[PDB]
Ligand binder design. Structure first.
Ligand code: HEM
Ligand code: HEM
Lengths: 147, 142
């Protein structure tokens, strides 16, 4: 797929600003997830500032920004050895459905809009959205590859 | 149990929203399909649609619940509600996304009045209504 250099810079530069507040931005991300769909808590076996709840939210942030660089360099999302199968196996094992990915995307954009209020743009969201969509498509491709 | 103070919060706020109920229905499903676009697959062009009339039902049946929960203590068609939602696979995630979008339409849309008790009033009225729908949804083989 095609991913312009401006879309890459929008994600990289905005993530460079959010790197220091990534911990607090992780808790707020899951606060909106658990506010929109509280049943999402059941998939996580882990009091209110839970470290693996932030560490998972950390991953959603950092892997999405890393995805934007791959979409510009090669045009696809590439995972490493024993990593693509792990992503698919875990999300499949806990029954992550499309609604969970799409609520997380909505909450992610809401956490990127309230973090940097003066960087966001109708072009900024599409950069983070496509980077998040291609990342989910790769996770879902390995989940649907258990034939 | 549903206190009289919680009833007044819903009844009075809905009286203001009665005139804008039509547009408030489209706004409810616009946020639903924005948060979880896969919800469209459960339904069947979509400018003005019967999805607004369906969203009308979500609005009007929730307001009816607040009056019923205060008058009698229960939500009072029920067999049809459970049967339809069961056949299309409406899960808990769908009910709570609709609740979030509903509350965003009751506090952030055109009704500009809000309170820590106002949201909880519509939330409990929506929960007891959904609990009754879900009680009839568990009328499957298990
Ligand atoms: C682009 C989106 C996502 C990415 C990049 C991502 C990434 C990850 C990573 C790195 C792990 C850790 C695996 C391990 O440590 O073995 C994980 C586990 C997990 N993820 Fe995701 N995830 C995403 C979306 C989601 C969504 C939407 C849900 C559901 C709300 C979800 C639920 C889980 C669960 C339940 C686990 C396992 C936690 C545990 O082992 O206790 N993930 N994910
Ligand atoms: C929360 C997520 C919900 C989803 C995803 C959902 C979905 C659906 C779907 C797909 C139908 C079938 C429509 C048709 O085939 O014509 C339906 C029917 C209906 N829904 Fe819901 N529903 C939800 C909640 C509610 C709530 C809270 C109410 C109000 C109490 C409600 C009121 C109705 C009514 C009255 C019908 C009857 C339609 C008919 O008889 O043709 N729904 N719903």
């Amino acid at each position: 797929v095609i991913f312009t250099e401006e879309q890459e810079a929008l994600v990289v530069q905005s993530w460079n600003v959010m790197k220091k507040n990534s911990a607090e931005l992780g808790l707020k991300l899951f606060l909106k997830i658990f506010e929109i769909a509280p049943t999402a808590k059941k998939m996580f076996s882990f009091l209110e500032q839970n470290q693996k709840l932030k560490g998972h939210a950390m991953s959603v942030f950092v892997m999405t920004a890393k995805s934007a660089a791959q979409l510009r360099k090669a045009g696809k999302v590439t995972f490493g050895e024993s990593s693509l199968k792990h992503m698919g196996s875990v999300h499949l094992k806990y029954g992550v459905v499309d609604e969970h990915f799409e609520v997380t995307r909505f909450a992610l954009l809401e956490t990127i809009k309230e973090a940097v209020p003066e960087m966001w743009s109708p072009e900024m969201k599409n950069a983070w959205a496509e980077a998040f969509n291609h990342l989910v498509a790769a996770i879902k491709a390995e989940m649907q590859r258990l034939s």
